[PDB]
């Protein structure tokens, strides 16, 4: 009767619904009883410190468990042959065959092999022993506590910031650009120059010797002379053995381009110069806004002045400043959309341009990292549109936004939604149509009647970057071009070596199979956008519920009248777009993994011929690569892929259990539960025990959330088991 202490409406519910709903509403502080705006920003401030500490505790644990139970020191000696260890296994359910099957990694105990790539990241940035891995763990344990204390401290009466502080847009932007982004990019440049690059060259540099070991022989004298190019002199030779002194240069700031020939990773001196340059640019950016000394910009002034005089945007951005500052959901949506794009850039640029030594020869790590971050990207992208829907319902005031860009969006929302509807159908009819054409034509023994479109636009873009594979002879591929001649003294020689070797993933060769899947990925991006945009733009009202904003973000329906109104809320379009987000990241990660496993075998022609029809995806990708995974145990034994073989079935089970919450709805279940309530009261020796909360069927919205979670969890566990075990089992 007191668990939802933030909600008197739930704490007076006599059912089991109170426990469920109190847990699901706990972090929605805006809806809690008696919430002021002061307290809302102060609880968010403290719980951001608490989240930060969780990230530091998660990182310290990964460092600690590798220092304690890993084979980091053995892996560092021979990184292409040793398989990195994540942590050890202590499971009393194991048989003795399982204990033996997991005793790989060069150790005497059951262990889990790591797919996270943390060995390659810690090696590349300098870590060499277990003792500095543990030193880093200790620092993060300290940092987590410092941020736990800071969270508690800024909840104290004297240290609780005012709303005027929380809404100082110009001072926060100045510090986050120049200090949080810019200075720490500069400080990371310092770490590479002072530690990572010297230890890539055999020389240990730690806290013990850093103040007496110069990063450069000349040493901070060329910098204070303008002879900056003296720091690019003598780069690492192509004979350099990473981690040792042989083949090593003395440069600390280069723009060579391409990959270190032995690690197949970006040069550490390119990376240090990247972070120095980015850091300088960001620090300059962090001086844009006026804080206390009369120079800089008012953000309000810039937005008000950007109304095009032709009048096509109406009042322009007048009143957007107040709308964004007052709406945390508008801020969250911008942050998640921006974060969602970056984590997709991270996935794309880390497989094509790897920075860590000897990664991209770890096919399991390379596959898991891509899959992980595209799935994070799809979740972040859904959340941005969901919180844009929450903004319009809850935080958008149409009278402070008269004729804005925001109000004019809502004025032509049917133009936007119907044109997404057309482009989704346009992509879907023909992308599926060509694939079905190709399947039918290949099934009838006539693969030469397939519709095979060459992706010339992308091939021309590859050639513009110097790819000499399609004879396009444009820009960088052209020998005598203004573009090619301009970059020739810097990165062009190294980049052309990197992009015209067929031994990496920089601008991979593409054909008709890649054309077809990109248009499928285009179909899924526009269709997911459609559901989410329709959810955001119809959130305030529609023709079925013109007063939909009076009911909130998540409500079950408006009942069976007016034809029926199931899934009419803006929340329900988040629900529906979650299936389309899972489908799209499936299409993306299925494509990435099949294209890579066929290349890693040396059989890229298997992808080239089989990707143009759907049976090629079914038999040559899903069915063919299933066999090491589903043989992780059998009546003839088990091996270390037994855990992924079990997670695979586990994922199919959770996914299918979600169907029960999504297909069968409440009325069936409430009537069963009434027969169970009767039987308990009538059964002797059992009616001595009484529920405190009346057992009820899950709510309409809750079952959608429970089924969505089960569907989503089953989706993730199945693919992760497949993408890791099929890659592990093949090694190629």
């Amino acid at each position: 009767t007191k668990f939802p202490k933030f909600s008197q409406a739930l704490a007076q519910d006599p059912a089991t619904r109170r426990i469920w709903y109190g847990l699901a509403t706990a972090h929605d502080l805006e809806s809690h009883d008696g919430m002021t705006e002061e307290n809302l920003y102060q609880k968010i401030f403290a719980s951001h410190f608490g989240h930060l500490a969780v990230i530091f505790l998660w990182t310290s644990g990964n460092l600690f468990h590798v220092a304690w139970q890993g084979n980091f020191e053995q892996w560092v000696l021979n990184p292409l042959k040793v398989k990195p260890i994540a942590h050890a296994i202590w499971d009393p359910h194991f048989g003795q065959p399982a204990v033996k099957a997991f005793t790989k990694g060069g150790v005497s105990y059951p262990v889990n092999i790591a797919t996270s790539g943390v060995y390659h990241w810690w090696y590349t940035i300098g870590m060499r022993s277990n003792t500095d891995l543990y030193a880093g763990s200790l620092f993060l344990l300290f940092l987590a506590g410092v941020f736990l204390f800071a969270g508690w401290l800024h909840l104290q009466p004297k240290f609780r910031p005012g709303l005027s502080w929380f809404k100082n847009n110009e001072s926060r932007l100045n510090h986050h650009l120049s200090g949080l982004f810019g200075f720490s990019s500069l400080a990371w440049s310092a770490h590479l120059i002072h530690v990572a690059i010297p230890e890539a060259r055999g020389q240990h540099v730690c806290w013990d010797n850093f103040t007496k070991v110069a990063p450069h022989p000349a040493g901070l004298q060329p910098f204070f002379t303008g002879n900056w190019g003296a720091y690019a002199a003598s780069p690492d030779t192509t004979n350099h053995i990473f981690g040792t002194s042989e083949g090593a240069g003395t440069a600390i700031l280069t723009f060579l381009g391409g990959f270190h020939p032995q690690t197949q990773a970006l040069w550490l001196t390119d990376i240090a110069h990247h972070h120095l340059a980015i850091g300088v640019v960001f620090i300059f950016a962090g001086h844009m806004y006026r804080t206390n000394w009369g120079i800089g910009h008012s953000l309000k002034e810039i937005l008000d002045a950007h109304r095009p005089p032709g009048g096509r945007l109406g009042a322009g951005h007048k009143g957007i400043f107040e709308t964004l500052t007052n709406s945390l959901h508008f801020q969250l949506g911008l942050a998640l959309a921006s974060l969602g794009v970056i984590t997709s850039l991270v996935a794309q640029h880390m497989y094509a341009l790897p920075s860590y030594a000897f990664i991209a020869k770890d096919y399991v790590t390379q596959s898991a990292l891509y899959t992980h971050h595209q799935y994070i990207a799809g979740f972040l992208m859904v959340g941005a549109f969901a919180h844009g829907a929450i903004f319009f319902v809850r935080d958008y005031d149409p009278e402070q936004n008269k004729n804005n860009v925001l109000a004019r969006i809502l004025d032509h929302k049917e133009a936007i939604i119907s044109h997404l509807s057309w482009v989704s159908l346009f992509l879907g009819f023909h992308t599926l149509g060509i694939y079905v054409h190709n399947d039918v034509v290949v099934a009838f023994g006539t693969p030469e009647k397939q519709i095979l479109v060459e992706p010339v636009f992308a091939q021309w873009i590859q050639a513009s970057s110097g790819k000499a594979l399609y004879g396009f002879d444009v820009l960088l591929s052209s020998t005598n071009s203004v573009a090619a001649n301009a970059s020739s003294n810097i990165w062009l020689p190294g980049w052309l070596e990197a992009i015209n070797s067929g031994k990496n993933s920089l601008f991979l060769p593409i054909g008709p199979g890649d054309f077809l899947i990109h248009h499928a990925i285009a179909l899924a991006l526009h269709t997911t956008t459609l559901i989410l945009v329709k959810g955001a733009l119809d959130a305030r009202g529609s023709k079925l519920m013109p007063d939909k904003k009076d009911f909130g973000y998540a409500f079950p329906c408006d009942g069976p009248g007016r034809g029926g109104t199931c899934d009419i809320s803006a929340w329900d379009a988040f629900y529906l777009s979650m299936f389309w987000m899972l489908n799209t990241i499936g299409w993306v990660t299925f494509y990435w993994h099949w294209k890579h496993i066929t290349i890693w075998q040396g059989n890229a022609g298997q992808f080239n011929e089989s990707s143009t029809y759907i049976m090629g995806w079914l038999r040559d990708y899903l069915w063919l690569n299933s066999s090491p995974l589903i043989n992780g145990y059998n009546p003839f034994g088990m091996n270390s892929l037994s855990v992924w073989s079990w997670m695979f079935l586990f994922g199919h089970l959770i996914w299918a259990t979600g169907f029960m919450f999504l297909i069968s709805w409440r009325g069936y279940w409430q009537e069963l539960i009434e027969t169970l309530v009767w039987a308990h009261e009538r059964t002797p020796l059992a009616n001595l025990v009484r529920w405190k909360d009346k057992p009820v069927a899950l709510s309409i919205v809750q079952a959608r959330l429970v089924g969505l979670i089960h569907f989503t969890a089953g989706y993730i566990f199945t693919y992760a088991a497949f993408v890791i075990a099929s890659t592990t089992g093949k090694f190629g």
Partner: peptide, 30 residues
């Protein structure tokens, strides 16, 4: 390699974090 004493240092510092996490959580709970 890591000594057991070194593991015990980590358990002390993580305990200090557990105590600070409780206090931050109680402050957030009010």
């Amino acid at each position: 390699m890591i000594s057991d004493t070194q593991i015990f240092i980590a358990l002390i510092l993580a305990l200090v974090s557990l105590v600070l996490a409780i206090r931050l959580g109680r402050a957030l709970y009010q």
